[PDB]
Enzyme design. Structure first.
Site, mmCIF file in Angstrom:
data_model
loop_
_atom_site.group_PDB
_atom_site.id
_atom_site.type_symbol
_atom_site.label_atom_id
_atom_site.label_comp_id
_atom_site.label_asym_id
_atom_site.label_seq_id
_atom_site.Cartn_x
_atom_site.Cartn_y
_atom_site.Cartn_z
ATOM 1 N N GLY A 15 7.858 46.439 64.206
ATOM 2 C CA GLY A 15 8.529 45.273 64.728
ATOM 3 C C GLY A 15 7.603 44.378 65.503
ATOM 4 O O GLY A 15 6.606 44.842 66.070
ATOM 5 N N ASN A 16 7.939 43.091 65.543
ATOM 6 C CA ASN A 16 7.122 42.080 66.210
ATOM 7 C C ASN A 16 5.747 42.134 65.557
ATOM 8 O O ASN A 16 5.655 42.009 64.322
ATOM 9 C CB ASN A 16 7.137 42.304 67.729
ATOM 10 N N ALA A 18 3.510 44.677 65.686
ATOM 11 C CA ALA A 18 3.045 46.052 65.780
ATOM 12 C C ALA A 18 3.788 46.951 64.800
ATOM 13 O O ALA A 18 4.942 46.703 64.433
ATOM 14 C CB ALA A 18 3.224 46.611 67.195
ATOM 15 N N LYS A 19 3.102 48.015 64.408
ATOM 16 C CA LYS A 19 3.630 49.096 63.598
ATOM 17 C C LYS A 19 3.096 50.382 64.206
ATOM 18 O O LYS A 19 1.950 50.422 64.652
ATOM 19 C CB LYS A 19 3.185 48.938 62.134
ATOM 20 N N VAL A 20 3.920 51.425 64.254
ATOM 21 C CA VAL A 20 3.484 52.722 64.761
ATOM 22 C C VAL A 20 3.684 53.755 63.661
ATOM 23 O O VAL A 20 4.768 53.845 63.078
ATOM 24 C CB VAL A 20 4.229 53.125 66.049
ATOM 25 N N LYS A 35 -0.614 53.041 66.929
ATOM 26 C CA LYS A 35 -0.073 51.695 66.959
ATOM 27 C C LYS A 35 -1.057 50.758 66.275
ATOM 28 O O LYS A 35 -2.232 50.718 66.635
ATOM 29 C CB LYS A 35 0.178 51.229 68.394
ATOM 30 N N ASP A 128 11.264 47.671 80.585
ATOM 31 C CA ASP A 128 12.087 47.821 79.388
ATOM 32 C C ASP A 128 12.303 49.294 79.075
ATOM 33 O O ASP A 128 12.228 49.710 77.914
ATOM 34 C CB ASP A 128 11.461 47.106 78.184
HETATM 35 C C1 LIG Z 1 16.607 59.589 64.923
HETATM 36 N N1 LIG Z 1 15.195 59.494 65.344
HETATM 37 C C2 LIG Z 1 14.207 60.116 64.426
HETATM 38 C C3 LIG Z 1 12.745 59.597 64.620
HETATM 39 N N2 LIG Z 1 12.494 59.154 66.004
HETATM 40 C C4 LIG Z 1 11.263 59.334 66.635
HETATM 41 C C5 LIG Z 1 10.340 60.304 66.206
HETATM 42 C C6 LIG Z 1 9.125 60.487 66.842
HETATM 43 C C7 LIG Z 1 8.776 59.699 67.932
HETATM 44 N N3 LIG Z 1 7.501 59.936 68.518
HETATM 45 C C8 LIG Z 1 6.640 59.066 69.079
HETATM 46 N N4 LIG Z 1 5.513 59.471 69.691
HETATM 47 C C9 LIG Z 1 4.728 58.552 70.214
HETATM 48 C C10 LIG Z 1 5.029 57.199 70.162
HETATM 49 C C11 LIG Z 1 4.240 56.164 70.710
HETATM 50 C C12 LIG Z 1 4.638 54.890 70.593
HETATM 51 C C13 LIG Z 1 3.878 53.819 71.119
HETATM 52 N N5 LIG Z 1 3.281 52.949 71.542
HETATM 53 C C14 LIG Z 1 5.883 54.504 69.923
HETATM 54 O O1 LIG Z 1 6.249 53.342 69.829
HETATM 55 N N6 LIG Z 1 6.611 55.557 69.387
HETATM 56 C C15 LIG Z 1 7.919 55.286 68.727
HETATM 57 C C16 LIG Z 1 8.942 54.733 69.788
HETATM 58 C C17 LIG Z 1 9.648 53.554 69.087
HETATM 59 C C18 LIG Z 1 9.429 53.858 67.585
HETATM 60 C C19 LIG Z 1 7.950 54.299 67.532
HETATM 61 C C20 LIG Z 1 6.227 56.857 69.511
HETATM 62 N N7 LIG Z 1 6.992 57.784 68.981
HETATM 63 C C21 LIG Z 1 9.682 58.729 68.360
HETATM 64 C C22 LIG Z 1 10.905 58.546 67.736
HETATM 65 C C23 LIG Z 1 13.437 58.164 66.571
HETATM 66 C C24 LIG Z 1 14.781 58.153 65.780
#
Ligand SMILES: CN1CCN(c2ccc(Nc3ncc4cc(C#N)c(=O)n(C5CCCC5)c4n3)cc2)CC1
Ligand SMILES: CN1CCN(c2ccc(Nc3ncc4cc(C#N)c(=O)n(C5CCCC5)c4n3)cc2)CC1
Lengths: 308, 306
Positions: A15-16, A18-20, A35, A128
């Site tokens: 989104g925006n 960025a992609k993770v 990221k 946020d």
């Molecule tokens: C039903 N669920 C299933 C999947 N599930 C989910 C799975 C793993 C993780 N881990 C994890 N570890 C490090 C992160 C560092 C980031 C940065 N900078 C970052 O943005 N993220 C996410 C947060 C927003 C989306 C990307 C990170 N996410 C987060 C969520 C959510 C829904």
């Protein structure tokens, strides 16, 4: 496909600008989150802000804040290699198991309060905090994502936003912390609505339901966060002394986090990295200067559990 | 001369934005004060709330080189902030009249300035607009800094003193301004200037300034700790307090973070006087104990001064 020493796997969010993506470090097998920010989509102003925020991310060293391991920058792309929280959102855990019992809620909320106070002490305010960046690692420890990053550099919250956003100082995180606490103990949001206008009216009214199972001490604690006037909210240094926060921690009162000294002389890990082809001298230079490079990332990742 | 509260209003010292500052005289004690006047009807509900937050910060500033708040008078339409009066005006006026400060005197004043700013930084209060107009001198030539913690619109920022990054609200921006301030004390001139704002900004960004023959190398070394383009590489005030030039002549008196004196609210001599003015003993004890910033605590404080 790959970037540097990492095999890129499935996208976790987008989104925006960025992609993770989840990814696997080739040298150690440890999983990470990467990221990816396409710099060609940013103007010089956004680029400068991004690099200031990356420098902020390099100073976050708290066991409940997503840790930055490595930075890779090409002419067109910025790659931020960081901790992966393998259990996803706290919300997913609440959906599966229901509300946390107060003992478990207290254990996780102590981690959250510690993390946020540690940032506030360094003049870093999240602004946020929300379901999507309150994460759990494989050992059920809290990991908070995106401290210090402007929203355009996140993948992308009205239920958590302080009523004065409906201001950018530390008090806005304190309000969000009260919402978080309420979600932990009840499994529900304290303020909701059929649309944004009704949500706003309820947030401005400030009233929320106390379920029969909530202790008076938990209720009193919520009152310290969920105050409409931002200046009447408790400070986190004051809330750290709250009776509910420390129930069961008699001689372990929650206090501001103090960073331990990083051991950069673990010869077992150094021996492994020499086997990988790095020289002892190179390793010591990267670690002592904390270069956030392929070497410091590997050393830190060798300190985590294998295959996860 | 009109009254507000227990004060006779005298000449206007400045006016700008939403504020006006007047010299005044306390009727009860004869002490001179400065009164900032803000018409609340000029403000929206948002700026009015911010104004009250910044007044709450002003209440905790208690440093001998920071303009001290004495009394708050709020009416339905107007806010009055009664505070310390710095009778010799701006440091700038002293520089005009006498030229650059010699090194000993510049050091003496700059220790006061650094102490005041470090005291605020430790309380997590950043000025952000230190400049000629709010670096003042009292009748004994002591520094008094005005407007700590106030947004510009509540004062009566400034290109020659503004850090190059503003061309950010952390302490680093004050550290840069402190460097410009030190240069003005030692030389009588601004380090960065120009025939217009464009040229002035160019020189700030380059970061170069003339070192006069009378500036010592120790002084030039100290300047280099404030006047760094990269804000992260600027010295911190706790670190700068240990600088050699700062402590020259103070070898057994190193500049340290200021610690407030213990407050004495039970001086019965002053309380006796205030009973004679018509306040009751019980009222006085309540006002002082709750630090109300009302007519009573103000009188108590003003009775403790020349
Ligand atoms: C039903 N669920 C299933 C999947 N599930 C989910 C799975 C793993 C993780 N881990 C994890 N570890 C490090 C992160 C560092 C980031 C940065 N900078 C970052 O943005 N993220 C996410 C947060 C927003 C989306 C990307 C990170 N996410 C987060 C969520 C959510 C829904
Ligand atoms: C050629 N000069 C002639 C004199 N003159 C001058 C004279 C006295 C003083 N004192 C004094 N003492 C407390 C103050 C508190 C304030 C607040 N808040 C505040 O704003 N001011 C000033 C600063 C900006 C204008 C109002 C205060 N000024 C200042 C200047 C300067 C020009």
């Amino acid at each position: 496909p790959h970037i540097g020493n990492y095999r890129l796997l499935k996208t976790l969010g987008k989104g925006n600008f960025a992609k993770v993506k989840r990814a696997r470090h080739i040298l150690t097998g440890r999983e990470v989150a990467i990221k990816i920010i396409d710099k060609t989509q940013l103007n010089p102003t956004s680029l400068q802000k991004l690099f200031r925020e990356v420098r902020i991310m390099k100073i976050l060293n708290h066991p409940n804040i997503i840790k930055l391991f490595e930075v890779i920058e090409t002419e067109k792309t910025l790659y931020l290699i960081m901790e992966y929280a393998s259990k996803g959102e706290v919300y997913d855990y609440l959906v599966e198991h229901g509300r946390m019992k107060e003992k478990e809620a207290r254990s996780k909320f102590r981690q959250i309060v510690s993390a946020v106070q540690y940032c506030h002490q360094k003049r870093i305010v999240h602004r946020d905090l929300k379901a999507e960046n309150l994460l759990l690692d494989a050992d059920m420890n809290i990991k908070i994502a995106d401290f210090g990053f402007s929203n355009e550099f996140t993948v992308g919250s009205p239920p958590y936003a302080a009523p004065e956003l409906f201001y950018d100082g530390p008090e806005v995180d304190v309000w969000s912390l009260g919402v978080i606490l309420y979600t932990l103990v009840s499994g529900s949001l304290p303020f909701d609505g059929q649309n944004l206008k009704e949500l706003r009216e309820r947030v401005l009214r400030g009233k929320y339901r106390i379920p029969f199972y909530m202790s008076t001490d938990c209720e009193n604690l919520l009152k310290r966060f969920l105050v409409l006037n931002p200046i009447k909210r408790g400070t986190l240094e004051q809330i750290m002394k709250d009776r509910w926060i420390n129930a069961g921690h008699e001689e372990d009162e929650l206090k501001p986090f103090v960073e331990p000294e990083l051991d950069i002389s673990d010869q077992k890990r150094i021996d492994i990295m020499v086997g990988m082809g790095y020289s002892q001298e190179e390793i010591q230079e990267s670690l002592s200067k904390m270069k956030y490079d392929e070497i410091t990332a590997t050393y830190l990742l060798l300190g985590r559990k294998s295959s996860e």
